[PDB]
RNA sequence: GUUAAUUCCGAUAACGAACGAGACUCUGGCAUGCUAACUAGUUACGCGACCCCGGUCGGCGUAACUUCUUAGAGGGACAAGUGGCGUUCAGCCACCCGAGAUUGAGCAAUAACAGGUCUGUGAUGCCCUUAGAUGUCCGGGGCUGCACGCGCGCUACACUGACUGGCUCAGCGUGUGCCUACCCUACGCCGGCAGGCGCGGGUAACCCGUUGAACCCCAUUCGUGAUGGGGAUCGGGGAUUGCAAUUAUUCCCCAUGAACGAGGAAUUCCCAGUAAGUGCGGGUCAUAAGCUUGCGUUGAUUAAGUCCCUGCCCUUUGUACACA
């Protein structure tokens, strides 16, 4: 039974959140880094925190981690959100129009349009899942 | 753990007081708590984007 | 002898393990044979680490029982050595081969258990354990209150178990357990 | 009835009331297309040979 | 889902938290690196003794050192790395490297027990006695009594053993007292023995003590006989401690020589330096361990699972119980 507790885990998350650039991959390097940056009164707790820091860095190298706020991953998230794609799928030359939608558009102001394509209605009214 | 002698009987008094921690050691102990993990704040530094020098003498 | 290991005066080789079910659980060939079966320990720390212990050391460790004899490993090494001498001076073959044949011909292939009892087959390591325990119990029963010594009784039990003449107490208890398991199935 | 040999390929679980018998999938080494499920006493690791006296009786899977 | 754990992952009318667990302290191996050593040793010599250049000497002294000895700062292990299982998170198994990849003890939450202690207190409330005392002292007896049953232990029921010689290995420890009148003992004589007499050492890594402890190792005697197993009971004698041994205080010598042939229903403890065999220290001690607590030697079988029995902890259900 080798399971870390919350006093190890939350403190290690704060250490990685505040000092992500100083920490690395090697255990015997970031162990001494966590010793120098954090006041840990015992070697056993220091080794637990350093091991959980190494395991979270392995999780970072494998992919994204939920309970963390890294500035570089936040910048990458902001870049992927602010990425602008090519021309839209809303701007099409052929837009499939159902006949009742064509009727209500005729009853509205814009009845006859330029780049619409009216389609045939789905014959056969079978749309419900059978019971049981 | 103290006693008090009343007229009817004798009552016991248990007073347990947890002392806070200080770095000096006057009001409390010198060694900190094992559960408390002290993490300092990183200094607000600005990353340089232009190679400059600080030559003197 | 830096090439081959001489168990006392006995070679490591010329050991014909007939049963293919016991070739991993009898550790006597080329890796776990030594000069004497005496050792320090550590063989019973893990679950399947007991199978890597050599069978002569297992007989050595299982011989010391019943209070007054628990903790005389040098003394039961003396017993096993003189018993191997008596086995060679009666049979004329390798006493290690006689002991392996005794394990094969004395280990019961089935047993009864409770899930009214039902008969199930046993593990091969469990069969080696049961065979060693039955032959040690037969040797101690033959040596209890008798002029015939413990080495002579253990030699007679191993030779009768390798022969299969239904004279050994281990062979008799194996036949009894086989009859009970054939009954309650 | 003859006496067969079977190699353990998978252990399933602990059976019995006291938990003394393992539920063991054994492949017959003579005919590898036929395999059965039995109860075996003692410690069983996957990949060893057992000596079956008969293949008629077979316990129910729980 | 996972863990020894309300330990975490993750959903979530919850969020922020607190005690416990975890964390903590000590004990144990890993260090040929540091600090140190005439209250400990090692290596080289100067000798001396013995055997035929070499070997031994805890026989002596010294030029370095801590490897053996000791205790301080430390460091070292954290699921660290690989391969699988698993929401790829929490975690689990195996393995290379490695002294350890689960050592043990202490502390140990809220609330309760009509649990034990008034016979620990000049801690104490209420009741009783208080001079022919339930205060205190002296002398003796008893707390040991014996048709019986129960509980914890010790010795054996034997040849894997008994007896006799030879050999060979420890650490917890303790040691001269306010009153206190009582310490541990080296060595030489008297005696078979318990012991007695003299000078010594030690307030303790100096002296007991290199702590020459048992099982175990080797060689004769025994021969399946309640026998050289076992030592219950009992007689005669000799010494130690104490004012006083009778109801044998304890120790030693000779002799008498019982049950016990592996123990029924039932029941206790345990899985690694563990059980068990075995002996040595402290407390009780003037005389004393068949007890207890520590320590050392030899040292396994079987298992890495389960609710079957006995109980415990979460969820749901039922209650006509709530001294449940």
UniProtKB/Swiss-Prot annotation, chain A:
Cross-link Glycyl lysine isopeptide (Lys-Gly) (interchain with G-Cter in SUMO1): residue positions: 102
Gene Ontology biological process terms from the UniProt entry: translation
GO molecular function: structural constituent of ribosome
Description of post-translational modifications: Ubiquitinated at Lys-102 by RNF14 and RNF25 in response to ribosome collisions (ribosome stalling).
Subcellular localization: Cytoplasm; Nucleus, Nucleolus
Top-level taxon of origin: Eukaryota
List of residues that carry Phosphoserine: 112
N6-succinyllysine, modified sites: 18
Placement of covalent cross-link Glycyl lysine isopeptide (Lys-Gly) (interchain with G-Cter in SUMO2): 102
Positions bearing Phosphothreonine: 129
Cellular compartments per GO CC: cytosolic ribosome; nucleolus; ribonucleoprotein complex
Record keywords, A-Z: Cytoplasm, Isopeptide bond, Nucleus, Phosphoprotein, Ribonucleoprotein, Ribosomal protein, Ubl conjugation
PANTHER family listed in its UniProt record: 40S RIBOSOMAL PROTEIN S17 (PTHR10732:SF0)
Binding partners and assembly: Component of the small ribosomal subunit. Part of the small subunit (SSU) processome, composed of more than 70 proteins and the RNA chaperone small nucleolar RNA (snoRNA) U3.
Recorded family membership: Belongs to the eukaryotic ribosomal protein eS17 family.
Function: Component of the small ribosomal subunit. The ribosome is a large ribonucleoprotein complex responsible for the synthesis of proteins in the cell. Part of the small subunit (SSU) processome, first precursor of the small eukaryotic ribosomal subunit. During the assembly of the SSU processome in the nucleolus, many ribosome biogenesis factors, an RNA chaperone and ribosomal proteins associate with the nascent pre-rRNA and work in concert to generate RNA folding, modifications, rearrangements and cleavage as well as targeted degradation of pre-ribosomal RNA by the RNA exosome.
NCBIfam families to which the protein is assigned, alphabetical: PRK01151.1
HAMAP family in alphabetical order: Ribosomal_eS17
Encoding gene (name): RPS17
Curated annotation (Swiss-Prot), chain B:
Subcellular location: Cytoplasm; Nucleus; Nucleus, Nucleolus; Mitochondrion inner membrane
Cross-link (Glycyl lysine isopeptide (Lys-Gly) (interchain with G-Cter in ubiquitin)): 31, 43
Changes after translation: Methylation by PRMT1 is required for import into the nucleolus and for ribosome assembly. Sumoylation by SUMO1 enhances protein stability through increased resistance to proteolysis.
Location of Phosphoserine modifications: 38, 53
Function: Component of the small ribosomal subunit. The ribosome is a large ribonucleoprotein complex responsible for the synthesis of proteins in the cell. Has endonuclease activity and plays a role in repair of damaged DNA. Cleaves phosphodiester bonds of DNAs containing altered bases with broad specificity and cleaves supercoiled DNA more efficiently than relaxed DNA. Displays high binding affinity for 7,8-dihydro-8-oxoguanine (8-oxoG), a common DNA lesion caused by reactive oxygen species (ROS). Has also been shown to bind with similar affinity to intact and damaged DNA.
Family to which this protein belongs: Belongs to the universal ribosomal protein uS3 family.
Name the UniProt record assigns to this protein: Small ribosomal subunit protein uS3
Name of the gene encoding the protein in the UniProt record: RPS3
Span covered, complete protein: 172 to 228 of 243
Swiss-Prot record, chain C:
UniProt subcellular location: Cytoplasm; Nucleus, Nucleolus
Principal cellular location given in the protein's record: cytoplasm
PTM sites of type N6-acetyllysine: 34
Keyword annotations: Acetylation, Cytoplasm, Isopeptide bond, Nucleus, Phosphoprotein, Ribonucleoprotein, Ribosomal protein, Ubl conjugation
PROSITE patterns per the UniProt record, alphabetical: RIBOSOMAL_S7
Recorded GO CC terms: cytosolic ribosome; nucleolus; small ribosomal subunit
Positions carrying Phosphothreonine: 1
Gene3D superfamilies: Ribosomal protein S7 domain
SUPFAM superfamilies: Ribosomal protein S7
BP terms from Gene Ontology: translation
Sites of Phosphoserine modification: 123
InterPro entries linked: Ribosomal_uS7, Ribosomal_uS7_CS, Ribosomal_uS7_dom, Ribosomal_uS7_dom_sf, Ribosomal_uS7_euk/arc
Gene Ontology molecular function terms on file: RNA binding; structural constituent of ribosome
Subunit structure: Component of the small ribosomal subunit. Part of the small subunit (SSU) processome, composed of more than 70 proteins and the RNA chaperone small nucleolar RNA (snoRNA) U3.
Protein's job: Component of the small ribosomal subunit. The ribosome is a large ribonucleoprotein complex responsible for the synthesis of proteins in the cell. Part of the small subunit (SSU) processome, first precursor of the small eukaryotic ribosomal subunit. During the assembly of the SSU processome in the nucleolus, many ribosome biogenesis factors, an RNA chaperone and ribosomal proteins associate with the nascent pre-rRNA and work in concert to generate RNA folding, modifications, rearrangements and cleavage as well as targeted degradation of pre-ribosomal RNA by the RNA exosome.
Similarity comment: family membership: Belongs to the universal ribosomal protein uS7 family.
Curated annotation (Swiss-Prot), chain D:
Locations listed in the record: Cytoplasm, Cytosol; Cytoplasm; Rough endoplasmic reticulum; Nucleus, Nucleolus
CDD domains cross-referenced by the UniProt entry: S1_S28E (cd04457)
UniProt cross-references to InterPro entries, sorted A to Z: NA-bd_OB-fold, Ribosomal_eS28, Ribosomal_eS28_CS
Modified sites of kind Phosphoserine: 35
Pfam entry (one): Ribosomal_S28e
Endoplasmic reticulum keyword on record: yes
One GO term (biological process): ribosomal small subunit assembly
Alphabetical keyword list: Acetylation, Cytoplasm, Endoplasmic reticulum, Nucleus, Phosphoprotein, Ribonucleoprotein, Ribosomal protein
Major subcellular location class: cytoplasm
Gene Ontology CC terms: cytosolic ribosome; cytosolic small ribosomal subunit; nucleolus; rough endoplasmic reticulum; small-subunit processome; synapse
GO MF entries: structural constituent of ribosome
Family of this protein: Belongs to the eukaryotic ribosomal protein eS28 family.
Role noted for this protein: Component of the small ribosomal subunit. The ribosome is a large ribonucleoprotein complex responsible for the synthesis of proteins in the cell. Part of the small subunit (SSU) processome, first precursor of the small eukaryotic ribosomal subunit. During the assembly of the SSU processome in the nucleolus, many ribosome biogenesis factors, an RNA chaperone and ribosomal proteins associate with the nascent pre-rRNA and work in concert to generate RNA folding, modifications, rearrangements and cleavage as well as targeted degradation of pre-ribosomal RNA by the RNA exosome.
Entries under PANTHER family matching the protein: 40S RIBOSOMAL PROTEIN S28, SMALL RIBOSOMAL SUBUNIT PROTEIN ES28
HAMAP family in UniProt: Ribosomal_eS28
Protein name, per record: Small ribosomal subunit protein eS28
């Amino acid at each position: 039974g080798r399971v870390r507790t919350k006093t190890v885990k939350k403190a290690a998350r704060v250490i990685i959140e505040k000092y992500y650039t100083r920490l690395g991959n090697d255990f015997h390097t970031n162990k001494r880094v966590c010793e120098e940056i954090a006041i840990i009164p015992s070697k056993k707790l220091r080794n637990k925190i350093a091991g959980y820091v190494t395991h979270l860095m392995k999780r970072i190298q494998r992919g994204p981690v939920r309970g963390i706020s890294i500035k570089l991953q936040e910048e990458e998230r902001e870049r992927r959100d602010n990425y602008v794609p090519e021309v839209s799928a809303l701007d099409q030359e052929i837009i499939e129009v159902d006949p009742d939608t064509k009727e209500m558009l005729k009853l509205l102001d814009f009845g006859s349009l330029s780049n619409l394509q009216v389609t045939q209605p789905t014959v056969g009214m079978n749309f419900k899942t059978p019971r049981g | 753990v103290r006693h008090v002698l009343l007229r009817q009987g004798v009552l016991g008094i248990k007073v347990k007081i947890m002392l806070p921690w200080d770095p000096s050691g006057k009001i409390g102990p010198k060694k900190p708590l094992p559960d408390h993990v002290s993490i300092v704040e990183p200094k607000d530094e600005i990353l340089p984007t232009t190679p400059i020098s600080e030559q003197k003498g | 002898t830096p090439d081959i290991k001489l168990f006392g005066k006995w070679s490591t080789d010329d050991v014909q393990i007939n049963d293919i079910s016991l070739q991993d659980y009898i550790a006597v060939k080329e890796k776990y044979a030594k000069y004497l079966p005496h050792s320090a320990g550590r063989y019973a720390a893990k679950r399947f680490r007991k199978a890597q212990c050599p069978i002569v050391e297992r007989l050595t460790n299982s011989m010391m029982m019943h209070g007054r004899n628990n903790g005389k490993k040098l003394m039961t090494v003396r017993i096993v050595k003189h018993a191997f001498e008596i086995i060679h001076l009666l049979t004329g073959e390798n006493p290690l081969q006689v002991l392996v044949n005794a394990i094969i011909n004395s280990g019961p292939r089935e047993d009864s258990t409770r899930i009214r009892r039902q008969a199930v087959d046993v593990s091969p390591l469990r069969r080696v354990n049961q065979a060693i325990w039955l032959l040690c119990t037969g040797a101690r029963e033959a040596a209890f209150r008798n002029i015939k010594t413990i080495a002579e009784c253990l030699a007679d039990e191993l030779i009768n178990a390798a022969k299969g003449s239904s004279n050994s107490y281990a062979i008799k208890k194996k036949d009894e357990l086989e009859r009970v398991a054939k009954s309650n199935r | 009835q003859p006496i067969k040999l079977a190699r353990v390929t998978k252990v399933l679980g602990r059976t019995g009331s006291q938990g003394q018998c393992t539920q063991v999938r054994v492949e017959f080494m003579d005919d590898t297309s036929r395999s059965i499920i039995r109860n075996v006493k003692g410690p069983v690791r996957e990949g060893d040979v057992l000596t079956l006296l008969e293949s008629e009786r077979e316990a129910r899977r729980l």
